[PDB]
């Protein structure tokens, strides 16, 4: 069975664990529940192919940024999540598909742009400049909300999708 090793990236509280846990568990988390699980697996369906998906759910805190060049290096490919009310949670995915391209030597990483929190009505990135920024890229973007398991799958799938088209 393919086994596809994501990684989770982006700034602190854009809601890369919410991401995480909607996709494995189906059950959305705030502040107060648990987020120290880092490592997830699922056997889950992606256009007809049962595969088996390992979610590498790093930290967006720059204390852990030396503990993301570590682990991730052994991923596949990467969700730059932000959070479409945080426009300098947008603007900080230039520092994480940047510490992306230098833990695996190449420019083009299977990768993936992943706006989150979008059931909030409070937008600070429109998607427009989020669908250029991921197109400058020449990555996908995605559209999700963990609260409402809006586009959840539609970004850790479409992700293996570009790791299958790498
Ligand atoms: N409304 C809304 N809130 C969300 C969404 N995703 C996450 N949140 C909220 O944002 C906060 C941070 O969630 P979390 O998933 O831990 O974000 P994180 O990026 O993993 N933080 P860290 O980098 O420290 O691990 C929580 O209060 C959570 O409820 C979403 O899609 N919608
Ligand atoms: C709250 C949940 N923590 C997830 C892992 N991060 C360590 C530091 N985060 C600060 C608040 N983040
Ligand atoms: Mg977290
Ligand atoms: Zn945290």
Not at 72 to 76: A, F, I, L, V, W
Not at 117 to 125: G, I, N
């Given at each position: 069975m393919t086994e596809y090793k994501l990684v989770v990236v982006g700034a602190?509280?854009?809601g890369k664990s919410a991401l995480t846990i909607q996709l494995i568990q189906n059950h959305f988390v705030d502040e107060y529940d648990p987020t120290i699980e880092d490592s997830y697996r699922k056997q889950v369906v992606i256009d007809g192919e049962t595969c088996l998906l390992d979610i590498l759910d790093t930290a967006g805190q720059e204390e852990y940024s030396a503990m993301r060049d570590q682990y991730?290096?052994?991923?596949?490919g990467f969700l730059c999540v932000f959070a479409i009310n945080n426009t300098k949670s947008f603007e900080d995915i230039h520092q994480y598909r940047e510490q992306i391209k230098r833990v695996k030597d190449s420019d083009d990483v299977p990768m993936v742009l992943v706006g989150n929190?979008?059931?909030?009505?409070?937008?600070?990135?429109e998607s427009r400049q989020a669908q250029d920024l991921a197109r400058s890229y020449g990555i996908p973007y995605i559209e999700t909300s963990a609260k409402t398991r809006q586009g959840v799958e539609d970004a850790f799938y479409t992700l293996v999708r570009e790791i299958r088209q790498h």
């Open positions: 602190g509280g854009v991730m290096r052994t991923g596949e929190k979008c059931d909030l009505a409070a937008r600070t990135v």
